[PDB]
Ligand binder design. Sequence first.
Ligand SMILES: O=C(O)C1=C[C@@H](OP(=O)(O)O)[C@@H](O)[C@H](O)C1
Length: 424
Amino acid sequence: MKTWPAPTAPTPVRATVTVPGSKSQTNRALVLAALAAAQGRGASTISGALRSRDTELMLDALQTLGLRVDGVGSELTVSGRIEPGPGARVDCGLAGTVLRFVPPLAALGSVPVTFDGDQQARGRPIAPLLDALRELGVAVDGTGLPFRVRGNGSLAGGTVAIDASASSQFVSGLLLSAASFTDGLTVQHTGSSLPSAPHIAMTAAMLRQAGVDIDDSTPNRWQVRPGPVAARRWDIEPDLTNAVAFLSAAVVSGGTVRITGWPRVSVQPADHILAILRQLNAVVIHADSSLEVRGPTGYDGFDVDLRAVGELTPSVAALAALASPGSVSRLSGIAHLRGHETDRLAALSTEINRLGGTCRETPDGLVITATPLRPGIWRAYADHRMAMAGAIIGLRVAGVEVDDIAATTKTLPEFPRLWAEMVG
Ligand SMILES: O=C(O)C1=C[C@@H](OP(=O)(O)O)[C@@H](O)[C@H](O)C1
């Protein structure tokens, strides 16, 4: 494969960028639309849906379950029934959301569904969710990929305790399908260190939009009452996490980047994002239905807690590597990143240090000392966000090339074109 040379920014980046839809929101809306259709409520349309590998894997997974998903652009319509064919096999790719959200849904059918994924997915956490499904009476063969859920046409539900410290998606996946369980579900996360609170909250918010009653008033416990899932039209927001990659260009170059269609009230962790950019002394404003970020003339080291927003880690680590020389930054709260698309702590450390940097992995994150970088080959590890972090680095370091820019298809297939258009 040819490398992708990361363009440099010898002068401030100035651009207006449109990012496509949220992966997290698109994939929840697909699941909820599938539940509504399966319950007999008719077809649902998702407007502004992301089209990426993760959402294609999700729509394919729904079609493997017997549903129909129409649309060649950003407008997707879901209709039909859960009626999987003999030996139905869901391909999970490297999509955690398919791996974690689809097994519950499948446990609603009367036909066994097998789940497989990419080689690299087989390393990611899954066993605690499979055990929770067994406790709820679903027959599940296997403790990792490939595994088979042997649905018999209903799932009883009730109460279950789970260790979700490795992934919030274990909670979200149970919550999405719970309204269709005979007695609903009460899920209790046991212990501590539950990452990605905003994504669990996203799940709860979208459930409420579909008319599901969920009680999230006590931390680490959720109660979903049995009931209908409404067929509705979904309006998907831009993906704010991917927007950060583009906004980071403003930050490192002292430029100005605007993101179109930025929501003033969001189901995504907008407030956490904007606060982090402001830590670096970027100026952030809402104007003309867009978000504008003006980078500072320079920035020093920062300490940032990423427990709630761990998917920002690659971009944030790139920012830390590009702080003023000798700056020390500490990224914390992110032990769970060892279980992501790749072990992102290990991968970021390797790649930064290969460029001459100083990144030390810690028990819960990274300590990054900004030092002069040099040319090299930034490896993506089949991880969209590793690829985009190398692009950020390359704005400020000539001769950086990403091995596999196409890893960005996971959530942002047009990244190369959008990035080129931004840098001009
Ligand atoms: O539910 C979701 O849509 C996601 C939740 C988070 O997972 P973890 O809680 O496993 O980190 C996030 O990192 C992921 O990219 C998307």
